Amino acid sequence: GLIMMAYQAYDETIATGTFFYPVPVNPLFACPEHLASLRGMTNARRVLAKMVPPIPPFLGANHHATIRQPVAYHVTHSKSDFNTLTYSLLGGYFKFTPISLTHQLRTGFHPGIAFTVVRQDRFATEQLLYAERASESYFVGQIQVHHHDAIGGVNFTLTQPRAHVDLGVGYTAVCATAALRCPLTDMGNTAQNLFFSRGGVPMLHDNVTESLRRITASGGRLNPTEPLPIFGGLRPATSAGIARGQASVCEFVAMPVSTDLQYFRTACNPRGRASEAYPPLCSSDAAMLRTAHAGETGADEVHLAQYLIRDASPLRGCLPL
Amino acid sequence: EAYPPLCSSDAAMLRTAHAGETGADEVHLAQYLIRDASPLRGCLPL
Amino acid sequence: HLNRVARAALLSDLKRRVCADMFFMTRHAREPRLISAYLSDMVSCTQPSVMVSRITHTNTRGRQVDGVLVTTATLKRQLLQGILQIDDTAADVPVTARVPADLVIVGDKLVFLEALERRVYQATRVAYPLIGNIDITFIMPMGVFQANSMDRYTRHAGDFSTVSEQDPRQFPPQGIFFYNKDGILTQLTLRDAMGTICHSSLLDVEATLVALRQQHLDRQCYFGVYVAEGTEDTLDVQMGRFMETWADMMPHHPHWVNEHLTILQFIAPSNPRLRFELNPAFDFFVAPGDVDLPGPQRPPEAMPTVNATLRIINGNIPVPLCPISFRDCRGTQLGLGRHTMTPATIKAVKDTFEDRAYPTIFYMLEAVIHGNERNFCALLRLLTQCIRGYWEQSHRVAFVNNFHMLMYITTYLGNGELPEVCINIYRDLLQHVRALRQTITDFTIQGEGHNGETSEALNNILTDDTFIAPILWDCDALIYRDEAARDRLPAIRVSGRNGYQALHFVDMAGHNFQRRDNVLIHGRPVRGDTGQAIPITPHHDREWGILSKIYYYIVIPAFSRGSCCTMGVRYDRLY
Amino acid sequence: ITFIMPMGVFQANSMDRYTRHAGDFSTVSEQDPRQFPPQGIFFYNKDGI
Amino acid sequence: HLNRVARAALLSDLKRRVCADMFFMTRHAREPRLISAYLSDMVSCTQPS
């Protein structure tokens, strides 16, 4: 086949469609105007082609071809530069497979997907309770004893029954969480591994799963034991003293890189729809966090592309920096 | 008379209107930040 | 009974009250007024009980005490130091008496301040209550980016600048910073996602396909979800009945074309494609029932089902979900220090691409040579004269289309046959291509191959052997494709019949332009013998296919911007 | 109580197109996405959203 | 007997308490509230006899 750059229909020295016939099969190489080269050109086909690229199915459908519509839309509707356009096309030309994803993650490239992190905590909580003066009626019985033979001697057990009745009109007592003291858990950074769980469909190739398991073990603070004991829960390997308490796991949930960011600024839903996880103060840059200490009482959100979200968790006026 | 509350014409000045450097800005180039003149001066914590 | 709207207003009231105060006492520890307000609210929030008493508990003065508050001694001390006021040390208590017991006034009623931790729960093996604990869920976004150009705004334009020409700030976010429980910096890197996303559970979509198969599926367009086979023809009447069927087989606008919607427009609840996006790696589309892909030319009509395919390209997600601005940002991030194109070469290439008056003589030569070294080896003078004449008349570099024509020029016509500017442009384009290839090599990890697949082909797509260039002139790439995998189930279809023959060295005596079978013209090798039973060998190394695919998928679309078209040739008229 | 809220008022005066600091809100785009006339208004909900 | 991990958590608590208060009298000399808190913690830290 051949590719001709600029379509001409006003060059009358050579008859239209004398040497080539437009038979394009590529989402990127859609040529609605070049179709007029072939005979039987009508207004209906042109009107249809102004919005839909004509691509044969016997040479690959758009849903079933590797190259799809959005890359064509990107290349046909972007006017920024050409070097940047070429590098963007190259970066898009990367497989989305788990091995490829591991490759980009170990490299440093940013795939076109984002994540959110959920971490569990356990805090020592104080409860503040006031009830009433006359909130409970408390009856007392008479003490009774049982002489029971024992090993060395005998056992005397003292028994006295009693009963309680709440002679209150409504809610007599109210108790609410008050104090925090030292956090018994850790505000650390430990990813929640998924290789512990079983039940999902395995890969048809064992070596792929084994390599993914071994690369997950590297760079993870909690990892499965190498012997992989069968008929068991696959407990994590023993370790030395964990720095400052029980580790807190962090799971990853994905979303597109462009997600409504001010949604994450306030107390939002872990799933994402009202149907809530408190976000504490976080920074997407090293600079943002150290400038979030109120250097000039100044808090910033976005500088160019990263983000700095304040605290919306109950730990607002706690945890001195 | 209708009392005008605090407002901004872009998301930038509204978020900077929290007195970031105790600083209340009014106009950057052409968009505007109109402060609170409604009776809700010292109410409605942000 | 304030019905739904006010019940939801109350619901939001509890929402904000919960969000505001769970650890208030340690929160506003430096604001003594707030604690007093909260205690006053708590004590003045429960209705009293029956006032019955024969002899009650009173202070030394005689005023009756009105309640008891229970905590631990820590908050006793923290309240008693400067927040609440001593009423007395002892009180009057019935015996069915003067006993030391603290008591504190709050609100308008007197209440005991009991923190009973010392008279009980020492040297006994029962744990103290009021030490319940709590389990809160914390939410951290990882790589959220803003698509809007207006949102790429800062506090001050010159906040964070460096000595580098390009700001090390345009790059999209890839890490999150927060504080440890002691105040030490903590960092999460994108490598940490492998604990969740890098498992085999990514391909368990069978359950979702089965579940979604049982919904209301109506008959829709079968253009983008159908694959056919070649009808064993010279590809002309094929296009004919394709256009005749295509012009009227549209039932409505395709669901996979309307990429112009933004995030908000695509996410509108009225969007029918809103429900057809389940997995980021999977494309869900409506397919006919009991149809084997590829099917016949006319799709059989039956109940439409749901079929899903894997997203090979990360950009296969719709451009509302993958912003063009983000793509440009990360593309700039990629080649920070890589080679760039000189303004001269880029202006010449763009001017010659957008040249509408481009003569068909170059197309004739490209079709006739058909990317064969034997053809190019005998047309040095004619090619030189043609390129010189076309160049030093409007300053446009030609012969850029066919990839098997530029490297031939830069190798053979490279000692000074052409003007210095033209060969410079060809060499600069080749430098850009090899810089792209080197960037591919940098971003992949070597030393890891699975099932006989090399790391380059395992990571990138343009380095993958299975995928092929839009146009192929020789059978070398096909041989590489159908030899490389050996685990990927192959199915080669050449306009009907399956499999190729690869017969080379065709002459005028046996031209046979009306050939319909699977004889593929591999072409005459230069440094070899044609023969008849000699096995077909690739004309070039494997890197040749890499360069051709890289050029066709990078240089051509970025410059043409979806304007150039691929098409066949009529040799029966050309020859 | 009835509130008042202007929506699209613009500063015609070239004198008044002044800022606190010249490079307050800038981008990587050659043209500032700030010269444009206002088209929306931002304020707070009763809960701070 | 909270074993190794909680002993190390206590160890870090010792770390922070040591780094926080060696010269608190001359440190938070302008904060009278903190000094009373430290004395209250001191006196309410030893059990009686």
C-alpha–C-alpha distance, residues C108 and C111, integer Å: 10
Q: Touch between chain E and chain D (3+ CB pairs, < 8 Å)?
A: no
- Inter-chain CB proximity C81 and E37 less than 8 Å: yes
Q: Which of C16, C154, C167 is closest, CB to CB, to D25?
A: C154
C-alpha–C-alpha distance, residues A70 and C230, integer Å: 27
Helix (H) or strand (E) holding C387: helix C380-394
Q: Which of A78, A110, A122 is closest, CB to CB, to C143?
A: A110
Asked if A111 contacts A101 with a C-beta cutoff of 8 angstroms, the reply is: yes
Method by which this entry was solved: cryo-EM
A223 touches chain C (CB under 8 A): no
The size of chain D, in residues, is 49
Sequence-ordered list of residues with C-beta below 8 angstroms from that of D10, at least 6 positions apart, any chain? B30, D37, D38
E6 touches chain C (CB under 8 A): no
**Contacts A–D by Cβ distance under 8 A:** 4
Paired sense of beta strands C109-114 and A20-21, if any: unpaired
How far CA C329 is from CA of A94, A112, C478, in Å, comes to 16, 12, 36
**Contacts A–B by Cβ distance under 8 A:** 12
C-alpha–C-alpha distance, residues E37 and E35, integer Å: 5
Q: Which of E12, E16, E36 is closest, CB to CB, to C81?
A: E36
List chain D residues with CB under 8 Å of A306: none
What does C104-138 look like in DSSP terms, one character per residue? EEETTEEEEEE--SSSSSSSSSS--SS----EEEE
- Inter-chain CB proximity D11 and B4 less than 8 Å: no
E31 touches chain A (CB under 8 A): no
Q: Which of C30, C77, C82 is closest, CB to CB, to E44?
A: C77
How far CA C76 is from CA of C27, C479, E43, in Å, comes to 17, 84, 14
Strand partners of residue A282: A309
A261 touches chain C (CB under 8 A): yes
Q: Report helix, strand or coil for C89.
A: strand
C-alpha–C-alpha distance, residues B44 and C110, integer Å: 32
Strand partners of residue A283: A308, C177
- Inter-chain CB proximity A266 and D28 less than 8 Å: no
Sign of torsion over alpha carbons A100, A102, A105, A108: negative
C353 touches chain A (CB under 8 A): yes
E13/chain A closest Cα distance in angstroms: 8
What does A28-88 look like in DSSP terms, one character per residue? TT--TTGGGGSSS--HHHHHHHTTS----GGG--TTTSSS-HHHHHHHHS--S-SHHHHHH
**How far apart are the two ends of chain E, measured CA to CA in Å?**
25
C-alpha–C-alpha distance, residues A308 and A262, integer Å: 11
Q: Which of C64, C58, C55 is nearest to C91 (CA)?
A: C58
Q: Which residue of C has its CA nearest to A110?
A: C174
How far CA C37 is from CA of A178, C33, C110, C197, in Å, comes to 14, 6, 16, 48
- Inter-chain CB proximity E4 and A243 less than 8 Å: no
Q: Which of D27, D28, D49 is closest, CB to CB, to A266?
A: D49
Q: Report helix, strand or coil for C364.
A: helix
Paired sense of beta strands A137-140 and A162-165, if any: antiparallel
Asked if A107 contacts C445 with a C-beta cutoff of 8 angstroms, the reply is: yes
C354: tokens are 């957008």
Sequence-ordered list of residues with C-beta below 8 angstroms from that of C429, at least 6 positions apart, any chain? C341, C345, C349, C400, C406, C555
How far CA C295 is from CA of B12, C162, C399, C496, in Å, comes to 56, 59, 39, 12
- Inter-chain CB proximity C81 and E44 less than 8 Å: no
Q: Which of C174, C330, A186, C437 is nearest to E10 (CA)?
A: A186
Q: Which of E36, E37, E44 is closest, CB to CB, to C73?
A: E44
Secondary structure letter of residue C547 according to DSSP = H
C-alpha–C-alpha distance, residues C433 and C410, integer Å: 14
- State the Cα angle at A67 between C370 and C436, rounded to 5°: 70
Q: Which of E5, E12, E13 is closest, CB to CB, to A246?
A: E5
Angle between helical axes of C343-353 and C420-443 (0-180°, round to 10): 100
C-alpha–C-alpha distance, residues C430 and C454, integer Å: 24
What's the farthest any 2 CA atoms get from each other in chain C? Answer: 131
E44 touches chain A (CB under 8 A): no
C-alpha–C-alpha distance, residues A251 and C193, integer Å: 8
- Inter-chain CB proximity C153 and D23 less than 8 Å: no
What does C443-499 look like in DSSP terms, one character per residue? HS--S--BTTB-HHHHHBSTT-SSS--S--SSSHHHHHHHHH-SSS----BSSSSBS
Angle between helical axes of C476-484 and C542-550 (0-180°, round to 10): 100
Q: Which residue of B has its CA nearest to C154?
A: B12
A246 touches chain E (CB under 8 A): yes
Strand partners of residue A121: C136
Backbone angles phi, psi at C285, to 5 degrees: -140, 165
- The amino acid at residue C129 is P
Q: Which of A257, A86, E19 is nearest to C550 (CA)?
A: A86
Strand partners of residue B34: B7
List chain A residues with CB under 8 Å of C226: 57, 61
Strand partners of residue A130: A174, C69
C-alpha–C-alpha distance, residues A116 and A114, integer Å: 7
Asked if C473 contacts C404 with a C-beta cutoff of 8 angstroms, the reply is: yes
Neighbour-count burial of A306, counting CB atoms closer than 10 A to its CB (0-12 exposed, 13-18 middle, 19+ buried):
buried
C-alpha–C-alpha distance, residues C507 and C504, integer Å: 9
Task: Report resolution (Å) to 1 decimal.
Answer: 4.0
Neighbours of chain D (3+ CB pairs under 8 A): A, B, C
List chain A residues with CB under 8 Å of C186: 187-189
Helix (H) or strand (E) holding C42: helix C32-43
Q: Which residue of D has its CA nearest to A265?
A: D49
Q: Report helix, strand or coil for A141.
A: coil
A130/chain E closest Cα distance in angstroms: 24
Asked if A49 contacts A35 with a C-beta cutoff of 8 angstroms, the reply is: yes
A15: tokens are 């008859």
List chain C residues with CB under 8 Å of E37: 78, 81
A165: tokens are 């009745």
Backbone angles phi, psi at C549, to 5 degrees: -65, -40
C-alpha–C-alpha distance, residues A218 and C384, integer Å: 58
Asked if C101 contacts C91 with a C-beta cutoff of 8 angstroms, the reply is: yes
Q: Report helix, strand or coil for C413.
A: coil
List chain C residues with CB under 8 Å of E44: 73, 77
- Inter-chain CB proximity D28 and C152 less than 8 Å: yes
How far CA C268 is from CA of A274, B20, C130, C261, in Å, comes to 16, 35, 48, 10
Best A222, A242, A246, A319 member to test E by mutation, with max E CBs in 10 Å, is A242
Q: Which of A30, A58, A113 is closest, CB to CB, to C294?
A: A58
Helix (H) or strand (E) holding C559: helix C556-560
C160 touches chain B (CB under 8 A): no
**How far apart are the two ends of chain D, measured CA to CA in Å?**
21
Backbone angles phi, psi at E8, to 5 degrees: -75, -35
C-alpha–C-alpha distance, residues C492 and C497, integer Å: 9
Helix (H) or strand (E) holding C185: strand C185-189
Sequence-ordered list of residues with C-beta below 8 angstroms from that of A103, at least 6 positions apart, any chain? C443, C444, C445, C455, C458, C459
- Inter-chain CB proximity A296 and B21 less than 8 Å: yes
Sign of torsion over alpha carbons A290, A296, A299, A305: negative
- Inter-chain CB proximity A298 and B22 less than 8 Å: no
Neighbour-count burial of B1, counting CB atoms closer than 10 A to its CB (0-12 exposed, 13-18 middle, 19+ buried):
exposed
Best D19, D20, D26, D44 member to test C by mutation, with max C CBs in 10 Å, is D26
- Inter-chain CB proximity C81 and E16 less than 8 Å: no
Helix (H) or strand (E) holding A119: strand A114-122
Cα A246 to the center of its chain, rounded Å? 23
Q: Which of B12, A113, B8 is nearest to C151 (CA)?
A: B12
C467: tokens are 């995928």
C-beta neighbour count of A264 within 10 angstroms: 21
Q: Which of A131, A139, A212 is nearest to A175 (CA)?
A: A131
Q: Which of A286, A263, A279, A274 is nearest to A313 (CA)?
A: A279
Q: Which of A52, A188, A309 is closest, CB to CB, to C257?
A: A52
Sequence-ordered list of residues with C-beta below 8 angstroms from that of A93, at least 6 positions apart, any chain? C313, C315, C460, C461, C462, C553, C554
Q: Which of D24, D42, D46 is closest, CB to CB, to B7?
A: D42
E4/chain C closest Cα distance in angstroms: 19
- The amino acid at residue A255 is M
Neighbours of chain E (3+ CB pairs under 8 A): A, C
Which residues in chain A (47-76) have CB-CB distances under 8 A to chain C?
Answer: 48, 51-52, 54, 56-58, 60-64, 66-76
C-beta neighbour count of A10 within 10 angstroms: 6
C59: tokens are 């202070």
Breaks in chain A (C to N over 2.5 Å), named by the residue before each, are 275
Backbone angles phi, psi at A79, to 5 degrees: -130, 85
Q: With left for phi above 0 and alpha for psi between -120 and 50, is residue C438 left, alpha or beta?
A: alpha
